[PDB]
Amino acid sequence: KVFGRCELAAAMKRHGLDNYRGYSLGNWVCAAKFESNFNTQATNRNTDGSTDYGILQINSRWWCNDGRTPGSRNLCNIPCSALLSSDITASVNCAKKIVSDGNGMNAWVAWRNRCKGTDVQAWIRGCRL
Numbered sequence: 001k002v003f004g005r006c007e008l009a010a011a012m013k014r015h016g017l018d019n020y021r022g023y024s025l026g027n028w029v030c031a032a033k034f035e036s037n038f039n040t041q042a043t044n045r046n047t048d049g050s051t052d053y054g055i056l057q058i059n060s061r062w063w064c065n066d067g068r069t070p071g072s073r074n075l076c077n078i079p080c081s082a083l084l085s086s087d088i089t090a091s092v093n094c095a096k097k098i099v100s101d102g103n104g105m106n107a108w109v110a111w112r113n114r115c116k117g118t119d120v121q122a123w124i125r126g127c128r129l
């Protein structure tokens with residue numbers, strides 16, 4: 001599923017990401033834009049044999065099991081395929097596990113480069129959220 005900006009913002013809001021560990025909603029929308037272009041089916045293969053999955057391009061080395069990232073972990077206790085669903089539950093829950101504290105969004109390089117230190121409120125503008 002390819003979400004619209006405000007559509008994803010609203011879903012992320014419903015799922016509790018607004019001000020999660022102090023990160024306002026726009027942060028998460030901004031990260032998703034530059035990680036996946038709001039496409040739940042986004043995948044990226046890395047040279048280390050890991051893969052990034054879903055709206056937030058969550059990586060298989062640590063966070064999910066894809067059965068092909070040898071010697072890796074699954075801290076979200078999910079198959080990585082769960083991160084490709086139109087149902088954003090698994091991606092949100094896993095994102096919350098990644099951000100386990102208030103510097104946690106540094107995990108996403110795209111967030112660091114495109115969102116951190118920015119007025120992320122623009123990401124929810126026009127959404128009435």
Ligand code: NA
Pocket residue numbers: 010011012014015
């Ligand atoms: Na929802």
Ligand code: NA
Pocket residue numbers: 060061062063064065066069072073074
């Ligand atoms: Na893994």
Ligand code: NA
Pocket residue numbers: 066080081
């Ligand atoms: Na797979």
Ligand code: NA
Pocket residue numbers: 001040041084085086
């Ligand atoms: Na899917």
Ligand code: NA
Pocket residue numbers: 030114115118
């Ligand atoms: Na930006």
